[PDB]
Coordinates of C-alpha atoms and ligand atoms in Angstrom, one line a residue:
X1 CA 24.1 -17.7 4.7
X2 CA 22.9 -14.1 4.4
X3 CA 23.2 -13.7 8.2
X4 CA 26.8 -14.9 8.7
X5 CA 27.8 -11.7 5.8
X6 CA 26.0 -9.4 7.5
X7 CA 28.3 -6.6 8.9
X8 CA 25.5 -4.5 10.9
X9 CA 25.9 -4.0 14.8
X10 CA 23.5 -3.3 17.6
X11 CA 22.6 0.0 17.1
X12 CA 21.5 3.2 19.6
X13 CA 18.5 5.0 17.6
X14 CA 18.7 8.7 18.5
X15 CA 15.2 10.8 18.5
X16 CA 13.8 12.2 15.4
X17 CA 14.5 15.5 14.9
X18 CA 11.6 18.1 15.1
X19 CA 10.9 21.7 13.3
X20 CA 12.8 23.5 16.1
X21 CA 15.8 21.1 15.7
X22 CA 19.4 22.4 14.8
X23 CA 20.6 21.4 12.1
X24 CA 23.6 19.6 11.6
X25 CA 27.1 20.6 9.9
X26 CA 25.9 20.8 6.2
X27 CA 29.3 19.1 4.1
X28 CA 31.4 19.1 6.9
X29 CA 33.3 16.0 5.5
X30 CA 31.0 13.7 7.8
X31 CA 28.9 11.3 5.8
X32 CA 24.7 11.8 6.5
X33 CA 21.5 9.7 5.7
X34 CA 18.8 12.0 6.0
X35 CA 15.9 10.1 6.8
X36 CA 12.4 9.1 8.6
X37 CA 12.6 5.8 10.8
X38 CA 9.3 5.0 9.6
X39 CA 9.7 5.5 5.7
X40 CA 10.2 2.2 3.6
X41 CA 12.0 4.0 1.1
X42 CA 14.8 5.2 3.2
X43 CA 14.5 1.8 5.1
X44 CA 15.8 0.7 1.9
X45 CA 18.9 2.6 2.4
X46 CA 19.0 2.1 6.1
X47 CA 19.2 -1.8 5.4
X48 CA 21.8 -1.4 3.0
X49 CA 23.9 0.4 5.3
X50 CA 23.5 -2.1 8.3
X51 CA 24.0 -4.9 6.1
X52 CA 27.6 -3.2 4.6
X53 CA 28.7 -2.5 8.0
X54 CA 28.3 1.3 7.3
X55 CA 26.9 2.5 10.2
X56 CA 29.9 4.7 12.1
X57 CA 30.7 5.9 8.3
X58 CA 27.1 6.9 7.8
X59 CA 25.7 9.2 10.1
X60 CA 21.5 8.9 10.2
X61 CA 19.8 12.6 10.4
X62 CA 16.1 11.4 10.6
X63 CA 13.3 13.7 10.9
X64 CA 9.9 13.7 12.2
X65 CA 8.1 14.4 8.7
X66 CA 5.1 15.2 9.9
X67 CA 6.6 18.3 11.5
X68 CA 10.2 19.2 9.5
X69 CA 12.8 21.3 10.1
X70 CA 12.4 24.3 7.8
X71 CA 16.3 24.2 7.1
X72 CA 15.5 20.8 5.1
X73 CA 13.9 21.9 2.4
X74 CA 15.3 25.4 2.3
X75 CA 18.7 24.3 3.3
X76 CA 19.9 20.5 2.3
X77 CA 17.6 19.4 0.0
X78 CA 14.8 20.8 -2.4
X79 CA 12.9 18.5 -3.7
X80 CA 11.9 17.9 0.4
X81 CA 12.0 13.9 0.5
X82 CA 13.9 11.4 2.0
X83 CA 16.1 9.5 2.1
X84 CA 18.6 12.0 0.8
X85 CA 22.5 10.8 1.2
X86 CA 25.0 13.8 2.3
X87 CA 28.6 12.5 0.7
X88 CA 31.0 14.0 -1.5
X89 CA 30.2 17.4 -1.5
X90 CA 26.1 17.0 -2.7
X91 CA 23.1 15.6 -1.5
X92 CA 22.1 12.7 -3.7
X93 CA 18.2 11.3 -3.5
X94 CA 16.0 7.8 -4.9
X95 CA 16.5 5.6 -2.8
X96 CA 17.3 3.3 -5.6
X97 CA 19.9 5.2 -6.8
X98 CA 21.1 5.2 -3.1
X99 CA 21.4 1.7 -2.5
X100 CA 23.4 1.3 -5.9
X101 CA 25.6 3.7 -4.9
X102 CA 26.4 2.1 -2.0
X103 CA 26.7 -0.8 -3.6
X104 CA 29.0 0.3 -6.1
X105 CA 31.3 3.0 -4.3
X106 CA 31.2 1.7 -0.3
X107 CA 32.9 -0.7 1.8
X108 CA 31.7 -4.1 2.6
X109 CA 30.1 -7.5 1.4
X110 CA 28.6 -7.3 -2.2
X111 CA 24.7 -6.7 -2.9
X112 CA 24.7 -7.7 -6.1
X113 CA 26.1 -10.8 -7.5
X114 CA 28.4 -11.4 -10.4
X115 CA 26.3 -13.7 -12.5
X116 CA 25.6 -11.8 -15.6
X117 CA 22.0 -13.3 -15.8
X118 CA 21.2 -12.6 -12.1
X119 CA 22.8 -8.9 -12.9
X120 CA 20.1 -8.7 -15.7
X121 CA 17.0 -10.0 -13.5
X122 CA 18.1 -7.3 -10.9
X123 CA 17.6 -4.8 -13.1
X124 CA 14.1 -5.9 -14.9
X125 CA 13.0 -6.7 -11.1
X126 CA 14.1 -2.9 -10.3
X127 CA 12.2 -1.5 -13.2
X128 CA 8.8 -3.6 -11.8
X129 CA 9.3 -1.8 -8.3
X130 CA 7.1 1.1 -8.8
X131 CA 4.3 -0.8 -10.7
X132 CA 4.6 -3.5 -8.2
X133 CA 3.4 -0.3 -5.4
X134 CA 1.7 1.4 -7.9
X135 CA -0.7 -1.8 -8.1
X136 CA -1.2 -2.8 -4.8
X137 CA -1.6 0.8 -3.2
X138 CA -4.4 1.7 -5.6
X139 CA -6.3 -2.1 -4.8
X140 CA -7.3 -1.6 -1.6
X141 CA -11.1 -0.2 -2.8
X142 CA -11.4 -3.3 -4.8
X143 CA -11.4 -6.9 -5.0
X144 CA -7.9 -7.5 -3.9
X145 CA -7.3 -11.3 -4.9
X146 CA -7.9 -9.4 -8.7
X147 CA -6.2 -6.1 -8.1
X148 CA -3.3 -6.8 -5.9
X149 CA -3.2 -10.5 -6.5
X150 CA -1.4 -10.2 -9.8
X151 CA 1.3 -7.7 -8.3
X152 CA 2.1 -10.4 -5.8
X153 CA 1.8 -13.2 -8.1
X154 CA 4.2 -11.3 -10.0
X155 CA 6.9 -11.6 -7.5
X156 CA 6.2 -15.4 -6.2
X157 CA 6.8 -16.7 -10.1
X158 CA 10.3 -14.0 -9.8
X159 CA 11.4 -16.5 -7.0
X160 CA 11.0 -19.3 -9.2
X161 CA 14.0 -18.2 -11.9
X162 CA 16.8 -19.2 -9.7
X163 CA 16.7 -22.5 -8.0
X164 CA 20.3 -21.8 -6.4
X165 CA 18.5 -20.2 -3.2
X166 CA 15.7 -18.3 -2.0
X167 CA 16.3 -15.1 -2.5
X168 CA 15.2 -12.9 -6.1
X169 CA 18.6 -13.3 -7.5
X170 CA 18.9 -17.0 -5.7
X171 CA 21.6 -18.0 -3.4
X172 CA 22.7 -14.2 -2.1
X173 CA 20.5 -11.7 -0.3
X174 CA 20.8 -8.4 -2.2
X175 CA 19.9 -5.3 -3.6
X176 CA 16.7 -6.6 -4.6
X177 CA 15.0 -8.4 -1.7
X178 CA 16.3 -4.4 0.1
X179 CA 14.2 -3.2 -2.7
X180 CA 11.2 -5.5 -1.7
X181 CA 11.1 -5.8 1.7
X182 CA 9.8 -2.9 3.4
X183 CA 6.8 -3.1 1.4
X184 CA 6.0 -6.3 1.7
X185 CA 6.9 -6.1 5.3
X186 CA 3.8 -3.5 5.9
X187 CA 1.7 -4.3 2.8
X188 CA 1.5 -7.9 4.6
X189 CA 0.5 -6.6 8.0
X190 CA -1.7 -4.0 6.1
X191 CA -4.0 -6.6 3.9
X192 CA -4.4 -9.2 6.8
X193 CA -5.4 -7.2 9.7
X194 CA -7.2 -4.8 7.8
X195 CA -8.9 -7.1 5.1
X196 CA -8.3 -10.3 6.1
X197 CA -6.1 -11.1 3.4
X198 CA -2.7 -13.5 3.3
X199 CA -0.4 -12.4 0.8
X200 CA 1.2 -16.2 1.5
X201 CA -1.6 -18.0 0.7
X202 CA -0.6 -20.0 -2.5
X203 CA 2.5 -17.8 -2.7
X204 CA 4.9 -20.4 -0.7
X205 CA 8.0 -19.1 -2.7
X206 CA 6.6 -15.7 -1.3
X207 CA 6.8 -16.9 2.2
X208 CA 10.1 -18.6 2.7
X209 CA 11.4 -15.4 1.4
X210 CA 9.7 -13.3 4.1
X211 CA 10.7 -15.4 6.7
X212 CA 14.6 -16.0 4.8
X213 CA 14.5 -12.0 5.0
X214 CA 13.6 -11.6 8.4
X215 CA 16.5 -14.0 9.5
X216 CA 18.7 -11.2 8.5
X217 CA 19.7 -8.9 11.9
X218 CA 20.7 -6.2 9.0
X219 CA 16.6 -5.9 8.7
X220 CA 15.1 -7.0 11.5
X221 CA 16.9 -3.4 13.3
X222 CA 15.0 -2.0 10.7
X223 CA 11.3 -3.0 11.3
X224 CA 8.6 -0.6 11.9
X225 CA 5.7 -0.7 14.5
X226 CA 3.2 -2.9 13.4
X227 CA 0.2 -1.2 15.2
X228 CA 1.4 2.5 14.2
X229 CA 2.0 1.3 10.7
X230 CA -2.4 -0.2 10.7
X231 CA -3.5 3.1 12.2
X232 CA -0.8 4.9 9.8
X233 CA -2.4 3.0 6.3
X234 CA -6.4 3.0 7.5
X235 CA -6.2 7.5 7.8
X236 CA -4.3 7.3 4.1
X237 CA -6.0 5.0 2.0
X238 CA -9.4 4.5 3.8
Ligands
GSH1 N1 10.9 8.1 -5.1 C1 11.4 8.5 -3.8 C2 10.3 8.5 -2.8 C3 10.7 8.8 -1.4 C4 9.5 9.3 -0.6 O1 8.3 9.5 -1.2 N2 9.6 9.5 0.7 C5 8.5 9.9 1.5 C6 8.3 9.2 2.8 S1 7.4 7.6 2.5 C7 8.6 11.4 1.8 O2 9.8 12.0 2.0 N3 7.4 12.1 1.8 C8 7.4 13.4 2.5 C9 7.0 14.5 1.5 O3 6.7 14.2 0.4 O4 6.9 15.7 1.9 C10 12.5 7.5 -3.3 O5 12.4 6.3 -3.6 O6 13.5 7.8 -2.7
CA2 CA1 32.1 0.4 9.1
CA3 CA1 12.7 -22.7 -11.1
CA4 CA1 14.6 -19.8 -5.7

């Protein structure tokens, strides 16, 4: 199963760092994940990580975003996002292109499966990521069964192409259920307490997957507060 490959540990969360914070040694030879504990697209990484066993080898730097350190922007990283990943002399940003790189240059159990054909639906399924947000985020005004319906439908008939396993790519969690997941994680809590609509309501592919993720302890360490997330989501969209 996807739990007995995890490598992730227990793990001590320290405090975000605020704009008074020091900053820490900039390409000192000690790997950094600069991040925000409540961003999905560094949770992305910060999954990724976990899951590899990649936790003492990557150091998390997160940051209260709200209220950065100056030396962020000015100092590490430019375009002033995260996550941003500190390794090999740069500071390299997407989270996408973070969890490939992972993936392809790291330590620990593989992400991404073998199987050319499952290689190929990874990569059509990580093309559809930011129309998949772009189309839910901008429904929430509208009739959401027609404007975010379709986005979700999208990824229930995904599960259907292989039967080897619920996951996108089948038997073996990876890169792309990472990819996924903290969206649908708060885009679910989002649309049913706020609008009273189930994303898993004729989506049962959809659903077994959510609760296949959530099995995983490499996630689950991950998981944001539901309550500030509601709050969070009402103040930017509504
Ligand atoms: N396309 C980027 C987006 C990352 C991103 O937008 N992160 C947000 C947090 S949800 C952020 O750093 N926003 C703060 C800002 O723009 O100043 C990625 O996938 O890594
Ligand atoms: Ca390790
Ligand atoms: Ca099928
Ligand atoms: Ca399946």
């Amino acid at each position: 199963t996807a739990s007995a490959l995890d490598k992730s540990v227990p793990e001590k969360l320290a405090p975000p760092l605020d704009a008074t914070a020091e900053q820490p040694p900039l390409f000192d030879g000690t790997t950094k994940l600069y991040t925000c504990y409540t961003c999905p697209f560094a949770q992305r990484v910060w999954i990724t990580r976990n899951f590899k066993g990649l936790q003492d080898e990557i150091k998390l730097v997160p940051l209260i975003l709200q209220n950065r350190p100056a030396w962020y922007p000015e100092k590490v990283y430019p375009p002033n996002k995260v996550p941003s990943l500190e390794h090999n002399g740069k500071i390299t940003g997407e989270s996408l292109d973070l969890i490939k790189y992972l993936e392809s240059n790291f330590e620990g159990p593989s992400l991404l499966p073998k199987d050319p054909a499952k290689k190929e639906f990874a990569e059509e399924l990580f093309s559809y990521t930011d129309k998949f947000n772009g189309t839910v985020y901008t429904a929430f005004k509208g009739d959401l069964a027609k404007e975010a319906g379709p986005a979700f439908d999208h990824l229930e008939n995904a599960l259907h192409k292989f039967d080897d396993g619920p996951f996108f790519l089948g038997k073996e969690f990876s890169l792309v259920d990472i990819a996924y997941i903290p969206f649908v994680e708060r885009l679910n809590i989002f649309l049913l307490e706020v609008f009273k609509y189930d994303i898993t309501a004729g989506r049962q592919k959809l659903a077994a997957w959510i609760e296949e993720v959530n099995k995983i302890e490499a996630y689950k360490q991950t998981k944001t507060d539901p309550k500030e997330l509601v709050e969070f989501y009402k103040k930017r969209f509504l």
